Amino acid sequence: RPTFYRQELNKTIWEVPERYQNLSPVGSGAYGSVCAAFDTKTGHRVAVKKLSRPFQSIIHAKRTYRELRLLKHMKHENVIGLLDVFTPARSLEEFNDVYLVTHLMGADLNNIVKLTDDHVQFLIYQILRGLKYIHSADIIHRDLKPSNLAVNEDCELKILDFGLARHTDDEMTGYVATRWYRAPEIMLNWMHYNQTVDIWSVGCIMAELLTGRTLFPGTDHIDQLKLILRLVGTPGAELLKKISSESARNYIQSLAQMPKMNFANVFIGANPLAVDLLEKMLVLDSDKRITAAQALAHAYFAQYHDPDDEPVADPYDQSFESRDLLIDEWKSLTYDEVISFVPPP
Ligand SMILES: OCc1ccc(-n2cnc3ccccc32)cc1
Ligand SMILES: [Cl-]
Ligand SMILES: [Cl-]
Ligand SMILES: [Cl-]
Ligand SMILES: [Cl-]
Ligand SMILES: [Cl-]
């Protein structure tokens, strides 16, 4: 067991192992408070996140378990991973606080977004390479957007900030980036959605790297659906059948029919292989979109694609998601996961 030291940073008590030094506040979300630190063990600048009220409700206890399980599983160059997890508690009886340690992220994609076609190839390649790994575990991100992508001076990219089913109605309302990257089936609750929603989000991201503009900057959910359908066309009877909400079906049928536009006349000057890939991602019927594994083999990525270096994940058991438990049962499962953690080589 390491020796812990205590200190108050911006109105909060932090108790951490001696290996973590020179803590300075650097974050203010909802999930927790975040400090930058130097790890004396590895030599890395690191992010230390202290969870707020991790066990205040069944909902919160289960979210805390979910986020730890997910972060302990992800071992990929293009995904956020866990360097350490710790609690100052000596027993389950006194267990209240959970701290997560990752590499310290600087720029997000917004901070770096003038880009060549070669920059767009390499950036979208890394998103698909990390997505193929994510989807192979039967995990759905549900919230890919430029603020959820960390990028360094060398244009190396990692995916972070997995959707933990946290996003709120008020957060999705009006002229907001939080909704611009979402698939229409999940934006308007048309159907049981699946991993294809992430490919729609990657298409909105690639289009914005090519043009420097948001592809669908809607002023509300209805404005955004009108922008989407003017690009990809209105649905035919085959997709209409697959919308379970009678009311969402009737509203769509109220709209005058529109054909799919010519993407060469929308993405003017773009590499033709870039245009062809966008047509394969931005398909209204989710059953018909290109998968991450299929996209990696598209000729657009010819100079980066290496099928011996696009790894898949170990199997990921999510049976806990259908389990009904007490606050103390989730907290007990969380404790075992903290104490069993094994750091990377
Ligand atoms: O909740 C897991 C988790 C998410 C993000 C991070 N994170 C990494 N580098 C950061 C820099 C600034 C703010 C947050 C940062 C750590 C942990
Ligand atoms: Cl230590
Ligand atoms: Cl990492
Ligand atoms: Cl504690
Ligand atoms: Cl964003
Ligand atoms: Cl598992």
UniProtKB/Swiss-Prot annotation:
<feature type="modified residue" description="Phosphotyrosine; by MAP2K3, MAP2K4, MAP2K6 and autocatalysis">
    <location>
        <position position="175"/>
    </location>
</feature>
<dbReference type="GO" id="GO:0045944">
    <property type="term" value="P:positive regulation of transcription by RNA polymerase II"/>
</dbReference>
<dbReference type="GO" id="GO:0048863">
    <property type="term" value="P:stem cell differentiation"/>
</dbReference>
<dbReference type="GO" id="GO:0048273">
    <property type="term" value="F:mitogen-activated protein kinase p38 binding"/>
</dbReference>
<feature type="active site" description="Proton acceptor">
    <location>
        <position position="161"/>
    </location>
</feature>
<dbReference type="GO" id="GO:0030316">
    <property type="term" value="P:osteoclast differentiation"/>
</dbReference>
<dbReference type="GO" id="GO:0000922">
    <property type="term" value="C:spindle pole"/>
</dbReference>
<dbReference type="GO" id="GO:2000379">
    <property type="term" value="P:positive regulation of reactive oxygen species metabolic process"/>
</dbReference>
<dbReference type="GO" id="GO:0002062">
    <property type="term" value="P:chondrocyte differentiation"/>
</dbReference>
<keyword id="KW-0418">Kinase</keyword>
<dbReference type="GO" id="GO:0010831">
    <property type="term" value="P:positive regulation of myotube differentiation"/>
</dbReference>
<dbReference type="GO" id="GO:0048010">
    <property type="term" value="P:vascular endothelial growth factor receptor signaling pathway"/>
</dbReference>
<dbReference type="GO" id="GO:0001649">
    <property type="term" value="P:osteoblast differentiation"/>
</dbReference>
<dbReference type="GO" id="GO:0051525">
    <property type="term" value="F:NFAT protein binding"/>
</dbReference>
<dbReference type="GO" id="GO:0090336">
    <property type="term" value="P:positive regulation of brown fat cell differentiation"/>
</dbReference>
<keyword id="KW-0597">Phosphoprotein</keyword>
<dbReference type="InterPro" id="IPR050117">
    <property type="entry name" value="MAP_kinase"/>
</dbReference>
<dbReference type="GO" id="GO:0051146">
    <property type="term" value="P:striated muscle cell differentiation"/>
</dbReference>
<dbReference type="GO" id="GO:1901741">
    <property type="term" value="P:positive regulation of myoblast fusion"/>
</dbReference>
<dbReference type="GO" id="GO:0004707">
    <property type="term" value="F:MAP kinase activity"/>
</dbReference>
<dbReference type="InterPro" id="IPR011009">
    <property type="entry name" value="Kinase-like_dom_sf"/>
</dbReference>
<dbReference type="Pfam" id="PF00069">
    <property type="entry name" value="Pkinase"/>
</dbReference>
<dbReference type="GO" id="GO:0071223">
    <property type="term" value="P:cellular response to lipoteichoic acid"/>
</dbReference>
<comment type="function">
    <text>Serine/threonine kinase which acts as an essential component of the MAP kinase signal transduction pathway. MAPK14 is one of the four p38 MAPKs which play an important role in the cascades of cellular responses evoked by extracellular stimuli such as pro-inflammatory cytokines or physical stress leading to direct activation of transcription factors. Accordingly, p38 MAPKs phosphorylate a broad range of proteins and it has been estimated that they may have approximately 200 to 300 substrates each.</text>
</comment>
<dbReference type="GO" id="GO:0033209">
    <property type="term" value="P:tumor necrosis factor-mediated signaling pathway"/>
</dbReference>
<feature type="short sequence motif" description="TXY">
    <location>
        <begin position="173"/>
        <end position="175"/>
    </location>
</feature>
<dbReference type="GO" id="GO:0032496">
    <property type="term" value="P:response to lipopolysaccharide"/>
</dbReference>
<dbReference type="GO" id="GO:0045663">
    <property type="term" value="P:positive regulation of myoblast differentiation"/>
</dbReference>
<dbReference type="GO" id="GO:0045648">
    <property type="term" value="P:positive regulation of erythrocyte differentiation"/>
</dbReference>
<dbReference type="GO" id="GO:0000902">
    <property type="term" value="P:cell morphogenesis"/>
</dbReference>
<comment type="subunit">
    <text>Component of a signaling complex containing at least AKAP13, PKN1, MAPK14, ZAK and MAP2K3. Within this complex, AKAP13 interacts directly with PKN1, which in turn recruits MAPK14, MAP2K3 and ZAK. Binds to a kinase interaction motif within the protein tyrosine phosphatase, PTPRR. This interaction retains MAPK14 in the cytoplasm and prevents nuclear accumulation. Interacts with SPAG9 and GADD45A. Interacts with CDC25B, CDC25C, DUSP1, DUSP10, DUSP16, NP60, SUPT20H and TAB1. Interacts with casein kinase II subunits CSNK2A1 and CSNK2B. Interacts with PPM1D.</text>
</comment>
<dbReference type="GO" id="GO:1900015">
    <property type="term" value="P:regulation of cytokine production involved in inflammatory response"/>
</dbReference>
<dbReference type="GO" id="GO:0071222">
    <property type="term" value="P:cellular response to lipopolysaccharide"/>
</dbReference>
<dbReference type="GO" id="GO:0060348">
    <property type="term" value="P:bone development"/>
</dbReference>
<keyword id="KW-0804">Transcription</keyword>
<dbReference type="GO" id="GO:0032495">
    <property type="term" value="P:response to muramyl dipeptide"/>
</dbReference>
<dbReference type="GO" id="GO:0005737">
    <property type="term" value="C:cytoplasm"/>
</dbReference>
<dbReference type="GO" id="GO:0071479">
    <property type="term" value="P:cellular response to ionizing radiation"/>
</dbReference>
<dbReference type="GO" id="GO:0002021">
    <property type="term" value="P:response to dietary excess"/>
</dbReference>
<feature type="domain" description="Protein kinase">
    <location>
        <begin position="20"/>
        <end position="301"/>
    </location>
</feature>
<dbReference type="GO" id="GO:0006915">
    <property type="term" value="P:apoptotic process"/>
</dbReference>
<feature type="modified residue" description="N6-acetyllysine">
    <location>
        <position position="49"/>
    </location>
</feature>
